[PDB]
Design an enzyme around this catalytic site. Sequence first.
Site, PDB file in Angstrom:
ATOM      1  N   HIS A 171     -20.487 -11.286 -16.947  1.00 55.58           N
ATOM      2  CA  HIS A 171     -19.698 -12.515 -16.964  1.00 55.58           C
ATOM      3  C   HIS A 171     -20.415 -13.635 -17.712  1.00 55.58           C
ATOM      4  CE1 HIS A 171     -16.723 -15.163 -14.601  1.00 55.58           C
ATOM      5  NE2 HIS A 171     -17.264 -15.920 -15.544  1.00 55.58           N
ATOM      6  N   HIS A 210     -20.040 -17.070 -20.774  1.00 55.16           N
ATOM      7  CA  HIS A 210     -19.375 -17.915 -21.767  1.00 55.16           C
ATOM      8  C   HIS A 210     -20.315 -18.193 -22.910  1.00 55.16           C
ATOM      9  CE1 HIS A 210     -16.084 -18.895 -18.962  1.00 55.16           C
ATOM     10  NE2 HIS A 210     -17.039 -18.686 -18.069  1.00 55.16           N
ATOM     11  N   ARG A 226     -19.095 -19.698 -25.763  1.00 59.18           N
ATOM     12  CA  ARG A 226     -18.495 -20.780 -26.543  1.00 59.18           C
ATOM     13  C   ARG A 226     -18.341 -20.352 -28.015  1.00 59.18           C
ATOM     14  NH1 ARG A 226     -17.106 -22.522 -21.563  1.00 59.18           N
ATOM     15  NH2 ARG A 226     -18.734 -23.802 -20.594  1.00 59.18           N
ATOM     16  N   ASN A 257     -12.076 -18.078 -22.731  1.00 61.09           N
ATOM     17  CA  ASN A 257     -11.556 -19.441 -22.563  1.00 61.09           C
ATOM     18  C   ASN A 257     -12.066 -20.434 -23.589  1.00 61.09           C
ATOM     19  OD1 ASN A 257     -14.116 -19.380 -21.348  1.00 61.09           O
ATOM     20  ND2 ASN A 257     -13.573 -20.978 -19.851  1.00 61.09           N
ATOM     21  N   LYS A 272      -8.820 -11.237 -18.258  1.00 60.09           N
ATOM     22  CA  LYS A 272      -9.283 -12.273 -17.335  1.00 60.09           C
ATOM     23  C   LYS A 272      -8.169 -13.164 -16.863  1.00 60.09           C
ATOM     24  CE  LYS A 272     -12.178 -15.016 -15.282  1.00 60.09           C
ATOM     25  NZ  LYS A 272     -13.185 -15.693 -16.106  1.00 60.09           N
ATOM     26  N   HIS A 276     -10.860 -15.187 -11.669  1.00 60.24           N
ATOM     27  CA  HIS A 276     -11.442 -16.417 -11.155  1.00 60.24           C
ATOM     28  C   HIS A 276     -10.611 -16.742  -9.920  1.00 60.24           C
ATOM     29  CE1 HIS A 276     -13.207 -20.606 -11.509  1.00 60.24           C
ATOM     30  NE2 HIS A 276     -12.247 -20.744 -10.612  1.00 60.24           N
ATOM     31  N   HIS A 305     -17.815 -14.157  -9.834  1.00 60.70           N
ATOM     32  CA  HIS A 305     -18.668 -15.187  -9.225  1.00 60.70           C
ATOM     33  C   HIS A 305     -18.289 -15.593  -7.801  1.00 60.70           C
ATOM     34  CE1 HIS A 305     -15.412 -17.533 -10.732  1.00 60.70           C
ATOM     35  NE2 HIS A 305     -15.893 -17.744 -11.939  1.00 60.70           N
ATOM     36  N   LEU A 360     -17.934 -24.147 -11.176  1.00 65.34           N
ATOM     37  CA  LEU A 360     -16.756 -23.658 -10.463  1.00 65.34           C
ATOM     38  C   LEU A 360     -16.874 -22.158 -10.358  1.00 65.34           C
ATOM     39  CD1 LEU A 360     -13.865 -25.918 -11.673  1.00 65.34           C
ATOM     40  CD2 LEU A 360     -15.294 -26.113  -9.655  1.00 65.34           C
ATOM     41  N   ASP A 409     -22.237 -16.078 -15.273  1.00 65.53           N
ATOM     42  CA  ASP A 409     -21.298 -17.163 -15.552  1.00 65.53           C
ATOM     43  C   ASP A 409     -22.019 -18.319 -16.242  1.00 65.53           C
ATOM     44  OD1 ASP A 409     -18.637 -18.427 -15.515  1.00 65.53           O
ATOM     45  OD2 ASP A 409     -19.339 -19.643 -13.834  1.00 65.53           O
ATOM     46  N   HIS A 458     -22.627 -26.713 -21.429  1.00 64.19           N
ATOM     47  CA  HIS A 458     -22.030 -27.920 -21.989  1.00 64.19           C
ATOM     48  C   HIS A 458     -23.132 -28.847 -22.463  1.00 64.19           C
ATOM     49  CE1 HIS A 458     -18.119 -27.029 -20.118  1.00 64.19           C
ATOM     50  NE2 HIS A 458     -18.842 -26.595 -19.096  1.00 64.19           N
TER      51      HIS A 458
HETATM   52 ZN   LIG Z   1     -14.597 -18.678 -13.459  1.00 58.87          ZN
HETATM   53 ZN   LIG Z   2     -16.764 -17.980 -16.051  1.00 57.17          ZN
END
Ligand SMILES: [Zn+2]
Ligand SMILES: [Zn+2]
Lengths: 345, 341
Positions: A14, A16, A18, A42, A100, A137, A175, A220, A248, A252
């Site tokens: 899992h 990200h 970007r 995402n 997802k 999620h 998560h 989150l 996860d 940022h």
């Molecule tokens: Zn999530």
């Molecule tokens: Zn995530």
Amino acid sequence: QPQTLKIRRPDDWHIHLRDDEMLSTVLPYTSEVFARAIVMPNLAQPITTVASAIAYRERILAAVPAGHKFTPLMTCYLTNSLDAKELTTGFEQGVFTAAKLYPANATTNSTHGVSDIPAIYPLFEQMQKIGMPLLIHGEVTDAAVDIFDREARFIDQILEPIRQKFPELKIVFEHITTKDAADYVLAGNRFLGATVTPQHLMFNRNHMLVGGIRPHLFCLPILKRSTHQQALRAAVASGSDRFFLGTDSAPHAKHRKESSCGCAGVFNAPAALPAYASVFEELNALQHLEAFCALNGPRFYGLPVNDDVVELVRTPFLQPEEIPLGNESVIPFLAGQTLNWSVKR
Amino acid sequence: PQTLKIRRPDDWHIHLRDDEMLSTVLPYTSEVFARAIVMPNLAQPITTVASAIAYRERILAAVPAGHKFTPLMTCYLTNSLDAKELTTGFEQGVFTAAKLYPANNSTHGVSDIPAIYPLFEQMQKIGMPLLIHGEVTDAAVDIFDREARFIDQILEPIRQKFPELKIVFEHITTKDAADYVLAGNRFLGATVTPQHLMFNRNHMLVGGIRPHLFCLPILKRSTHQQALRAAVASGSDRFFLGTDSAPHAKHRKESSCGCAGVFNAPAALPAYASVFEELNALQHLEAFCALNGPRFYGLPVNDDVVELVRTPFLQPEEIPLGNESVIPFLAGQTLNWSVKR
Ligand SMILES: [Zn+2]
Ligand SMILES: [Zn+2]
Ligand SMILES: [Zn+2]
Ligand SMILES: [Zn+2]
């Protein structure tokens, strides 16, 4: 000579990554250690087609440093209007490893997420038929539900009905953060698995709020009370094969975290494996680390286990305070702290 | 537009800070409130009569011309505080009350609360009120549970031993506290902030983390918010206005470790009016703002009046502070009520 631990090369189920300059900056921290990672879809324009997934995969591969061996496992972002054929052929062509589910407005770049989840049951039926895993999620978004209760409500209201109707659909409860989730997964079967982050193992909501408010621990689903943290720790320490590594990692820029409205997400890729090692050590459970990091995930997805090994060495290692990103920066997980474990080069 | 004339209110719980911050923030309070209970937690806490007199003078010097305002000073209780200092301060009119902060050495705050029972005995004897920040600090206790634990572990024993000691349970945030105060007697009162009436922890955390809603005691779940709202709407005289206005510079709020405290002085009275309106309880607003507090402390009620007018009122985004700034409560939002002086 300091304590060493040899394990099969892990994967991150899992993450990200970007895009653009952020992608270039953050990927190396993952590709250095992990052979594969489940890459979440995402982006600003969510990954909903085979074409966009192929293009994103190419951008990721271009960011892999020379000398690293890394393969991104792509995911499809489920939507209310998504065409099932796009999902099916993407899975059969090896573009999509999984799909997802984001409840609409649950998190970052989720405005195009699924608003009425039972409406896309026909997609789940198709996924069940072809053997495509569903990653979730798991939080309700109802405004009347307290944020700390949203995971538990999801279990009864959304997840259980999905599992009753599609008993052979492979589902990863991503998560997990609660005893409710831990117990539910432990009481399930081989079609239900879960990922656990380092921050939900290492911390609880007191760390985010006592003595000051700490947005770099804001993610989150939100950090829960210590009781829930301890249940997660006991779950992974049990050696149950239903749980596997998923960071996860959700980076940022600093200014987007330290603002009047801070973005959710911890950038934990830099110290990910050493952090997990520290947790399993504290739990007297280092014998179960390998399974969690390198075996449980592949076995759940039905993918091969890595041939390589990595060596963890118990020597100190200082996390940097900041990681540069153009003229901005990203604050890593455990910034400025000293980890007890390192990875042998 | 609809108007509401009430006696001039007081603010029974405020932080004015000091120096340039004091000069900047006080006018927002002195414009509307005739008196305010001024908390003693400066960099050097107010633990002597001398330091209280000096701080009072600095506050009075910062009052703008044409404002009528009197600060009511408080003594910061410590383990080594001398009872005579408390007694003479009260009798000289310097201290209006004493404030209990649980620690988190003996100079700086109370670590072992039963050890200062002799101070409470003296306070009970002379009629000096005890103001309490009611939270335990035990590391094993979850932050959202700290107020409730305080009630059983610390407050109830104090009330059993000193049944005629006037106690204000400051800035209550829980149904536990609301129910406990409602079940008490005339010697137990409580202040309630606008933020704990208007918001719950979801507002601080859903869709992003919002440090300008971060304060102590922390915002609780909606259940508790609703209990506070029902408590003040009942018209019980045990509750009164205390903003706990606690200003910090923007950069100290929006950082890797944000300071606790909401700067709610600028829109304080209009904010409360909005709440009492939503609760169909405007008939109880005057008592909460202007009567319940004075009657609990045994102080006179103000002769002046203020007018609340139901016309829109835009909160500024930022309030200047030298080269820095302070973000006010409800920054950039529109309140339905304004104050005509
Ligand atoms: Zn999530
Ligand atoms: Zn995530
Ligand atoms: Zn306080
Ligand atoms: Zn205060």
